[PDB]
Amino acid sequence: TKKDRVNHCLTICENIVAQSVRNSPEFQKLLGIAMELFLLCSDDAESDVRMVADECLNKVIKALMDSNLPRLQLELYKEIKKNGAPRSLRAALWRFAELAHLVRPQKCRPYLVNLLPCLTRTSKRPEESVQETLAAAVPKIMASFGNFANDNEIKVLLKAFIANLKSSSPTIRRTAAGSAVSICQHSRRTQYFYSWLLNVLLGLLVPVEDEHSTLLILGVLLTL
């Protein structure tokens, strides 16, 4: 059913846009169920299946950025907390940084608290492909969800990424460095959080005539 699996994903897409009926108590139930089903089409391992049905999920969103944005972004936060496959969790993470500057500031503060449990688990993941796209979303997420957090929530998040400077992969060393520095542009106080990252790193190289674990010497010079 490898050619039978291709025709199933594509017919669900066109019969939502051609409804021309939104915000209906019949239309609300239909969009939750078959939206998680667009990514199982990408989770199945075939390049004829993985390439075809990922461009089809983008037809739904952009025709619905006007009409149903609060219905779109509620099904999508659920999958990160599911913490699924490294192919399933990845291509959902493109979708969520581009819709971060589409939220309203009325509903934004509930969206901030729920992500910091979800944004630390994908920092502890050793998959070198999952760690890459997060260095292209923590630029985009915490610049629009930046100003809504206090001084309590943002001190927890930066102690985690420095423990991702203690890994030996060259792909994972440069994605934890561009995450610490994109927050401090948008944290709450842009100048208060620049002085705080310089105290943490120089105790990692406090007096230089020591053994400093030469993989960890390279973690401190890329955040700078």
Side-chain angles (χ1 to χ4, degrees):
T1 63
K2 288 184 179 181
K3 289 183 180 180
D4 284 331
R5 192 179 294 115
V6 178
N7 283 316
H8 182 72
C9 309
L10 192 147
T11 60
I12 298 171
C13 177
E14 290 180 353
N15 298 319
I16 300 168
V17 179
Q19 292 292 320
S20 181
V21 48
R22 288 92 161 93
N23 208 165
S24 178
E26 181 65 30
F27 182 73
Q28 289 181 357
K29 187 178 179 181
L30 187 273
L31 194 145
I33 296 168
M35 179 68 196
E36 295 177 354
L37 297 176
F38 281 107
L39 295 167
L40 295 173
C41 303
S42 66
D43 200 2
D44 291 331
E46 184 177 1
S47 65
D48 290 330
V49 185
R50 288 178 294 170
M51 289 299 292
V52 166
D54 180 73
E55 291 178 351
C56 191
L57 188 273
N58 298 118
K59 289 182 181 179
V60 175
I61 308 298
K62 189 170 289 296
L64 295 177
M65 288 192 287
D66 192 2
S67 182
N68 291 114
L69 200 276
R71 183 63 177 169
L72 278 177
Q73 285 175 353
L74 197 146
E75 299 293 327
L76 288 179
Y77 173 68
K78 291 179 181 178
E79 289 191 358
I80 296 177
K81 189 183 289 294
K82 286 181 180 178
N83 201 4
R87 289 182 182 177
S88 179
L89 188 145
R90 177 184 179 273
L93 197 273
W94 287 350
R95 268 69 169 171
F96 304 164
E98 303 292 329
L99 301 176
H101 69 274
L102 260 289
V103 306
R104 292 173 62 188
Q106 183 177 1
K107 296 178 182 179
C108 65
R109 180 63 179 172
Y111 282 112
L112 194 147
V113 183
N114 288 113
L115 264 292
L116 294 178
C118 292
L119 280 172
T120 55
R121 298 179 184 176
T122 58
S123 67
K124 297 178 183 179
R125 176 171 288 173
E127 183 71 26
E128 295 182 356
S129 177
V130 176
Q131 290 292 328
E132 194 273 331
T133 61
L134 190 145
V138 176
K140 292 178 177 67
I141 293 170
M142 294 300 292
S144 63
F145 289 108
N147 296 315
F148 300 135
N150 213 170
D151 200 3
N152 291 317
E153 292 87 3
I154 291 177
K155 281 184 181 179
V156 179
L157 200 278
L158 293 175
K159 292 180 183 179
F161 280 92
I162 299 172
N164 287 322
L165 276 316
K166 292 183 175 67
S167 296
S168 68
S169 178
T171 62
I172 203 170
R173 285 180 296 167
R174 71 183 66 189
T175 62
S179 171
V181 190
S182 177
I183 298 168
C184 298
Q185 294 180 359
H186 310 93
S187 175
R188 179 61 177 268
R189 291 176 287 173
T190 66
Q191 286 297 110
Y192 174 71
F193 278 93
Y194 288 157
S195 177
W196 185 72
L197 283 180
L198 286 177
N199 289 319
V200 179
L201 298 175
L202 303 178
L204 302 174
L205 288 87
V206 78
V208 302
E209 297 294 326
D210 288 328
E211 293 180 354
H212 291 284
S213 178
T214 63
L215 297 174
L216 193 148
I217 304 175
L218 289 176
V220 175
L221 295 174
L222 207 151
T223 76
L224 292 177

